Design a protein around this ligand. Structure first.
Ligand SMILES: *P(=O)(O)OCC(C)(C)[C@@H](O)C(=O)NCCC(=O)NCCNC(=O)Cc1ccc(C2=C3CC[C@@H](OC(=O)NCCNC(=O)CCNC(=O)[C@H](O)C(C)(C)COP(*)(=O)O)CCC[C@H]3C(C)=NN2)cc1
Lengths: 554, 1036
């Protein structure tokens, strides 16, 4: 608009500029064009100087001025959504009892948790996060997602008094287990809220179906609930943060990206993996084809606080590793000692929200973003530990993007577009390192309930997956920090392994991780590796050639 | 010592740094891979704080802590160190005497320009401070040309002063983050490199003729001796070019670049010219790039082209469109852009850089903004000049040009005239925007009046009479002398005159009026000379109906001429085909007719003579001449050269052509004796030698081709009588062999190499070299008496000496027109603007005025070869053929392939049986690659058109082993060369340029060789020859 005309009046030193005038007749030049664009930025408008030069007249150029950042949508979005990779995986795997596949948490607030306040916060949090209203409709024999407006019954609400019952814990356990099973994916609330009142205060149970949440989305939901609760309890109208790009648009962009040349250029890598992974096979104590989830036992190992603190602060420096590189190199040695396999395929969950779509902002978007990608670890070269950590470290940077591309090629990309891929590496061992287990316990307005029991959000959530669903991963390994202790959890079917064989694996894990912490913390110098230098394609033999050669030049 | 901890990071070189590292390793013939900035700082700088602020600057920039590692790697790398302190040398000279200060300073500065930076060792900046006086500090910076362009210094010195103001006042820093050059790398990776190169491959499509500017001498050395010629346009003109730019809606830079294009169009002559613009290859698409330090500055082929009638406004817009379209792709390095051209490395040879903001008064501009202790009071810069000419332009209140020119290769008179022409273009274009690209004059009035001196010198007061009277006025002087002889029988001058009177009287009784035409179908015999002169005393146009020609073309000459009468002998009359009476010259009535003269009613302008020729158009052309044309030529020939009464002169040429019916009168009007060859003997060189022995012929006429041929009969030329004194020649672009130089020297021969196209007059320009060493391709000559030779452009405008253009011929030596298709007179003839009311004739010949004032020959414009850059002078190829002793007779011709693409070819006759590849190899020594014949055919004899020129249209077009995949010369060396090139197996000594290789592969090659062959071998070796065996001397 006429902002741009006034900027020509300034930068071309001219008054009474006509609405039609031509930049070169006005005495303009490329030196004026850059200054015009450098002026519009102070109004948050972006214009290309190339467009200003090609279209030298006020109106032609004004038709191409854009805002310097995209405004993400504020409305109540609705309508169809394409199934993202992990959602299509979920409906593909066809669990028995799919409706009861949840995530949950129990909050606590010693000074009480007034019903109408939380109901009003729920009305807002579900209206604002345009994915917690999904419906899965099974039309035409496929499954098709529909995201719906203020059609009523956004969530299911219940309130109970437990103060009169002598066993509060068993009462809340029983009723939360009763809530989990009531999920309808078709035409019903995916969010179940239950308020339990207790002699020492009130508790909030949230259960949300896994198709619409993940760990980051729980951090979003807790901080937006805390802000809404504070706002309403003080008395002002509830004002949640600005909505980033809604899950519908993310799905549409992921459909449109799934066929681009950028993703398909990863095919030679995932081919080079799968063709090499084919015969890699985990031994079992018993051959049994499937097990229901009630067969999942688990067991835990804990590092002491002093060894945990060495891990988190000191041990990374000797190779510039991330925490995962050390936890995986320990898992590698643990499998090498326990199985005596030469090679192993481990599935890694990623946080999923990578910059795959250049315009996309997703940090405030709620949905199931988790990406699955396999990582083949060498166990052959395990002898010199110094050189095994470098090999494992390098694998994690060789992997394209952060593996988000693998699941898109498997479940979204068009079947003629993807070539040699032969997606036959099912999960056997799966790994995920959670950070601080503090997605919950990070605002003073409430805290993780003592009564949480089987309803936790992590791996030890007994209640949130159906007892009669199938075990889709043989070993599921998760780390977390609690009380400043690292706790590594091994979840396995008691029909596929005996307890003494997983106790071996978890003790052999603990010795090899303590070896890696000691090794990387006793090593005084720092040894960078080729992934640390900006040379695209550097290799160890070449990097030590150049570090001999600089020592001979200088 | 070094420990691994010191390296911050490592990077692949960007294409610009690849360019500079190629240069800095190959082009080590000189040491100036270096920029030097000299700054003066009046006031009171504090030496310690300024020394500190330079170290904070070096710690701040990763560029300044880069070292470039290249010697043995898979690929060159940047390596960045966390600390790399640059040398700062401080000198106090406050006590020194003023001449000793300025001496010691200038010595240090010159030594600093000469000391090289080792890219893998030395810190790639130097500083020295000189404390002159007590308040007059000076600083000298020098950096390697690989770090950053000169302009980046305006960023760096702003950082420096911000640091110094901080370190003095103790205030903490206000400097923003360094904008990372890796951001531009990721953008170079984002761009579709194929689509970019495809664009330039489309821009350079029609680029046949390579542009040049006139160079005093060949480029025998890369060592510069720079000079600067600087000049400005007046206020009234500099505001006018800005107004012209505003009205046509283009930038003033596009006005300046279009004016420079129009200059390069008038130099040369081509409507298609190209020169290097220099562009800040900083894409506006990237954040912070105007504060980003590195090599962004790049050169791109600016290319101006016009249509014939295009007005300056239309060209100015077409250039504007082209430069806006080019703007996306200007980040492509010139060495890639060169890869797409047919010319490769040779594409650009001068620059035109326009500077709205110089470094002075952008560095010096800071003054009022800060309380720093000093005022910066000059800055000077020295840079590696890469091109023999750079035109700087600074748009200001006066448009200040500066030619940075190599005084080794440009005469300062060339550069001065270049500046005068550049102003005269600007003057015309500014006074009226709508003028065409033709009819813009280049010339200042001094050179205009100098060129209009050539018409006025060589003027003459010759008597310009009617023609046959001049023979009369000679025959009266010595009638008894023998005038003409044929076989063994002759005429006296009296007999010739009387017999002409008889024929003329009889023709007049037969009704011949002087304006009429009469054919001369006659044998080269006594009767034929009498024929010509009798028809001429009847006044008529004596049509040269050559009896040897096929009857169809003779019938054309007869009918198209509508001739009433013909003079013949009997036996030829089988060739007559027309409703025409015919005077048998033997008839008894002519013998009974009076021998006395008859009263001349003739006038000097009357229709004198006619000719028909071979040609490119199908119909016979029908030239015509007037008596005044012979009068002027004859007086020039007789008074300014020699033919004499004692000379035995051959009419050595066939009667069908221009020279023959001038060499005749050239003998009679001087009083010599004409000998006629019995015309079968004209085909028998051995019998011509015998005839010249028998008759002692003293003056000769040789066709250009005949002169190429005769002296190869080396034993007959040794046997030749020493009576020869003058040779006359005609036909274009004579080739002189050193052998025939020897044979001219043996007899001190006056070779009159005349020239002139038959339609204006038979010759108009003259060269001779009686004792002096002869050029192997003799120049045209001087203009002769009462003629104006000119060189003009398509606007009929003059153009400066030493530059090529179309030859125009004017004066007394110009015919009336063509007899039929008479509007060809309008296509070929004009009234001379430069001698108002003199006739002028447009040749299509390309010609040039030379430094000594001779005219120089470049051939017919329709025939203009322009193969792959080069306006190839074909006579040089023929010269290197004919000077090769194993060749007798050889011819070079322009031929086209099945696409219509031009290629050079040769037709060769040998002295002896040999493998023809030997003479191809001899040319491969004697000639550049662009001018060796593409293929060769070998023959027994080469025929000719009857004018003596080779029948190139009749000669038949030509038609129509070193691989080493298992036959190594030395196994290791060739296998490595193959493994480096990778795209193909390689031949025994295969050629990297025929393989189309590139500089980046070359650096990878040498750096591979340095580790894999262990040869400490100069990269220059690979650019001298790609022949693999050269490494054998280095590895031993
Ligand atoms: P194989 O083929 O063998 O490999 C090839 C090589 C590598 C071996 C080798 O042959 C090769 O090709 N490369 C290296 C050697 C070579 O030939 N050079 C080509 C590589 N590129 C170059 O570096 C070419 C080059 C060298 C030297 C000079 C000299 C200059 C510099 C020009 C000029 O620069 C400026 O600072 N001014 C430019 C104008 N102003 C600008 O800043 C840009 C204009 N536009 C802008 O964007 C502006 O910045 C504004 C103000 C923002 C807006 O303007 P608007 O757009 O109009 C300064 C003058 C000095 C010159 C002189 C005299 N010497 N050298 C130039 C080019």
């Amino acid at each position: 608009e006429s902002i741009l005309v006034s900027i020509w009046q300034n930068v071309l030193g001219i008054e009474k500029i006509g609405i039609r005038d031509n930049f070169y007749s006005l005495g303009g030049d490329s030196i004026q064009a850059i200054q015009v664009v450098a002026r519009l930025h102070s109004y948050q408008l972006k214009l290309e100087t190339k467009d200003l030069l090609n279209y030298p007249t006020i109106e032609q150029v004004a038709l191409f001025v854009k805002s310097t950042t995209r405004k993400s949508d504020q409305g109540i979005i609705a309508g169809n959504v394409p199934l993202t990779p992990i959602q299509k995986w979920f409906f593909g795997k066809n669990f028995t009892n799919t409706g009861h596949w949840n995530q949950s948490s129990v909050l606590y607030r010693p000074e009480g948790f007034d019903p109408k306040v939380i109901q009003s916060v729920m009305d807002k949090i579900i209206e604002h996060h345009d994915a917690l209203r999904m419906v899965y409709q099974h039309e035409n024999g496929n499954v098709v997602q529909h995201n719906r407006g203020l059609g009523g019954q956004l969530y299911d609400f219940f309130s109970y008094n437990l103060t009169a019952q002598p066993d509060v814990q068993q009462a809340i356990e029983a009723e939360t287990q009763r809530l989990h099973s009531s999920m309808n994916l078709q035409e019903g609330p995916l969010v179940k809220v239950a308020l339990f009142q207790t002699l020492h205060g009130d508790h909030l149970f949230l259960a949300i179906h896994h198709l619409v949440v993940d760990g980051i989305s729980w951090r979003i939901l807790f901080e937006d609930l805390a802000t809404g609760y504070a706002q309403a309890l003080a008395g002002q109208a509830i004002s949640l943060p600005e909505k980033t790009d809604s899950f519908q648009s993310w799905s549409q962009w992921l459909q449109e990206y799934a066929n681009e040349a950028d993703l398909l250029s990863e095919i030679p890598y995932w081919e080079s993996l799968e063709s090499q992974a084919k015969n890699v096979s985990l031994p079992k104590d018993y051959e049994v084809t499937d097990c229901k989830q009630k067969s999942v036992r688990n067991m835990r190992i804990r590092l002491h606080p002093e060894e945990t603190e060495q891990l988190l602060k000191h041990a990374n420096q000797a190779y510039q590793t991330e925490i995962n590189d050390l936890l995986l190199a320990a898992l590698g040695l643990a499998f090498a000692e326990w199985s005596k396999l030469a090679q192993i395929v481990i599935h890694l969950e990623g946080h999923g929200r990578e910059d795959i779509i250049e315009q996309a902002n997703v940090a405030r978007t709620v949905g199931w973003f988790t990406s699955q990608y396999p990582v083949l670890l060498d166990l052959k070269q395990t002898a010199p530990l110094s050189d095994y950590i470098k090999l494992t470290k390098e694998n994690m940077r060789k992997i394209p993007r952060k593996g988000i591309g693998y699941d898109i090629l498997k479940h979204v990309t068009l079947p003629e577009n993807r070539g040699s891929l032969s997606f036959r590496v099912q999960p056997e061992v799966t790994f995920n390192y959670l950070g601080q287990f503090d997605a919950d316990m990070r605002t003073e307005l409430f805290t993780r309930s003592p009564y949480s029991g089987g309803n936790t959000l992590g791996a030890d959530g007994k209640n949130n997956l159906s007892p009669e669903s199938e075990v889709y991963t043989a070993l599921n390994i998760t780390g977390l920090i609690e009380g400043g202790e690292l706790v590594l959890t091994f979840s396995y079917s008691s029909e596929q392994y005996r307890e003494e064989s997983i106790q071996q694996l978890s003790q052999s894990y603990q010795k090899h991780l303590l070896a890696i912490i000691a090794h990387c913390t006793e090593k005084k110098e720092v040894e960078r590796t080729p992934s640390d230098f900006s040379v695209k394609g550097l290799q160890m033999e070449e990097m030590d050639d150049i570090f001999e050669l600089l020592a001979n030049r200088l | 010592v070094f420990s691994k901890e010191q390296v911050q990071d490592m990077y692949a070189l960007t294409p610009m740094q690849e360019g500079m590292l190629f240069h800095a390793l190959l082009d080590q013939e000189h040491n100036s891979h270096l920029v030097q900035m000299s700054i003066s700082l009046q006031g009171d700088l504090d030496v310690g704080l300024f020394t500190d602020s330079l170290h904070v600057l070096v710690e701040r920039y990763d560029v300044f802590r880069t070292l470039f590692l290249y010697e043995k790697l898979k690929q060159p790398l940047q390596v960045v160190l966390k600390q790399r302190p640059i040398p700062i040398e401080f000198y106090d000279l406050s006590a020194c005497d003023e001449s000793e200060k300025q001496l010691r300073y200038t010595q240090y500065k010159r030594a600093d320009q000469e000391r090289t930076f080792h890219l893998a060792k030395d810190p790639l900046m130097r500083v020295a401070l000189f404390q002159m006086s007590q308040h007059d500090y000076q600083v000298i910076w020098s950096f390697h040309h690989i770090l950053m362009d000169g302009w980046c210094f305006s960023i760096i010195f702003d950082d420096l002063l911000a640091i110094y103001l901080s370190l003095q006042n103790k205030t903490a820093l206000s400097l923003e983050p360094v904008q990372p050059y890796s951001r531009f790398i990721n953008w170079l990776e984002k761009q579709n490199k194929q689509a970019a190169l495809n664009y330039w491959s489309d821009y350079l499509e029609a680029y046949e003729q390579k542009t040049t500017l006139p160079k005093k001498e060949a480029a025998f050395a890369k060592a510069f001796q720079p000079t600067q010629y600087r000049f400005s346009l007046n206020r009234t003109l500099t505001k006018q070019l800005g107004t012209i730019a505003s009205q046509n809606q283009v930038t003033l830079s596009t006005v300046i670049q279009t004016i420079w294009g129009v200059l390069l169009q008038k130099y040369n002559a081509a409507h298609d010219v190209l020169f290097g613009s220099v562009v800040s290859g900083r894409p506006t698409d990237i954040v912070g790039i105007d504060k980003m330090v590195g090599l962004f500055i790049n050169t791109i082929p600016f290319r101006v082209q016009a249509k014939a009638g295009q007005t300056f406004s239309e060209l100015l817009q077409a250039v504007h469109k082209r430069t806006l379209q080019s703007q996306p792709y200007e980040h492509v390095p010139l060495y890639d852009i060169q890869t797409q051209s047919v010319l490769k490395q040779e594409l650009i040879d001068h620059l035109l850089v326009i500077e709205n903001y110089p470094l002075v008064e952008a560095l010096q501009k800071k003054a009022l903004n800060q309380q720093i202790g000093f005022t910066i009071t000059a800055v000077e810069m020295f840079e590696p000049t890469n091109y023999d000419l750079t035109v700087m332009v600074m748009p200001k209140e006066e448009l200040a040009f500066r030619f940075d020119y190599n005084a080794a290769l440009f005469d300062e008179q060339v550069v001065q005239k270049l500046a005068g022409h550049l102003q005269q273009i600007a003057d015309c274009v500014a006074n009226n925007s709508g003028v065409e690209l033709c009819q813009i004059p280049l010339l200042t009035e001094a050179e205009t009046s100098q060129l209009l001196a050539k018409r006025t010198e060589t003027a003459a007061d010759y008597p310009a009479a009617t023609m046959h009277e001049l023979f009369s006025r000679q025959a009266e002087k010595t009638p008894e002398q023998v005038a003409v002889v044929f076989a063994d029988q002759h005429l006296t001058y009296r007999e010739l005159d009387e017999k002409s009177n008889q024929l003329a009287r009889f023709l007049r009784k037969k009704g011949i009026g002087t304006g009429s035409l009469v054919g001369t179908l006659l044998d080269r015999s006594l009767d034929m000379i009498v024929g010509i002169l009798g028809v001429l005393k009847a006044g008529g146009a004596f049509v040269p109906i050559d009896p040897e020609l096929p009857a169809e073309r003779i019938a054309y000459m007869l009918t198209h001429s509508r001739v009433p009468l013909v003079v013949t002998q009997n036996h030829l009359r089988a060739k007559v085909t027309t409703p025409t009476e015919t005077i048998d010259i033997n008839t008894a009535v002519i013998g009974e007719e009076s021998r006395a003269p008859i009263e001349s009613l003739n006038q000097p302008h009357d229709l004198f003579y006619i000719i028909y020729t071979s040609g490119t158009t199908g119909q016979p052309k029908g030239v015509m001449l007037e008596h005044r044309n012979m009068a002027n030529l004859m007086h020039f020939t007789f008074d300014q050269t020699n033919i004499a009464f004692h000379e035995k002169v051959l009419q050595y040429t066939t009667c069908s052509f221009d020279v023959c019916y001038q060499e005749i009168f050239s003998t009679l009007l001087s009083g010599g004796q004409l000998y006629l060859i019995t015309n079968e003997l004209r085909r028998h060189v051995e019998k011509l030698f015998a005839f010249i022995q028998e008759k002692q012929i003293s003056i000769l006429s040789l066709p250009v081709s005949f002169l190429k041929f005769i002296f190869n009969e080396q034993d007959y030329a040794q046997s030749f009588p020493r009576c020869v004194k003058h040779i006359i020649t005609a036909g274009e672009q004579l080739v002189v062999t050193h052998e025939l130089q020897k044979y001219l020297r043996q007899h001190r021969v006056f070779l009159h190499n005349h020239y002139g196209p038959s339609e204006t007059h038979v010759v108009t320009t003259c060269t001779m070299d009686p004792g002096q060493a002869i050029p192997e391709l003799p120049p045209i000559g001087k203009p002769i008496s009462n003629t104006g030779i000119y060189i003009l452009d398509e606007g009929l405008q003059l153009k400066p000496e030493g530059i090529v253009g179309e030859l125009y011929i004017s004066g007394a030596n110009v015919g009336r027109g063509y007899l039929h298709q008479p509007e060809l007179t309008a296509e070929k003839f004009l009234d001379n603007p430069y001698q108002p009311g003199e006739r002028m004739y447009r040749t299509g010949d390309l010609a040039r005025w030379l430094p000594d004032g001779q005219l120089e020959f470049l051939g017919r414009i329709d025939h203009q070869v322009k193969i792959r850059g080069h306006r190839i002078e074909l006579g040089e190829i023929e010269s290197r053929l004919l000077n090769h002793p194993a060749i007798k007779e050889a011819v070079v011709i322009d031929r086209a392939d099945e696409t219509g693409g031009k290629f050079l070819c040769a037709y060769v006759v040998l002295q002896k049986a040999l493998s023809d590849e030997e003479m191809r190899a001899y040319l491969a020594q004697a000639l550049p690659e662009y001018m060796i014949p593409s293929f060769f055919v070998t023959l027994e004899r080469i025929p000719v058109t009857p004018n003596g020129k080779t029948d190139r249209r009749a000669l038949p077009k030509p038609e129509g082993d070193y691989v080493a995949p298992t036959t190594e010369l030395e196994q290791k060396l060739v296998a490595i060369w193959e493994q480096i090139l990778g795209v193909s197996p390689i031949g025994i000594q295969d050629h990297f340029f025929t393989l189309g290789g590139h500089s980046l592969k070359a650096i990878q090659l040498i750096s591979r060789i340095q580790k894999e062959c262990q040869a400490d071998v100069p990269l220059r070796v690979l650019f001298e020859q790609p022949t693999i065996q050269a490494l054998a001397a280095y590895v031993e």
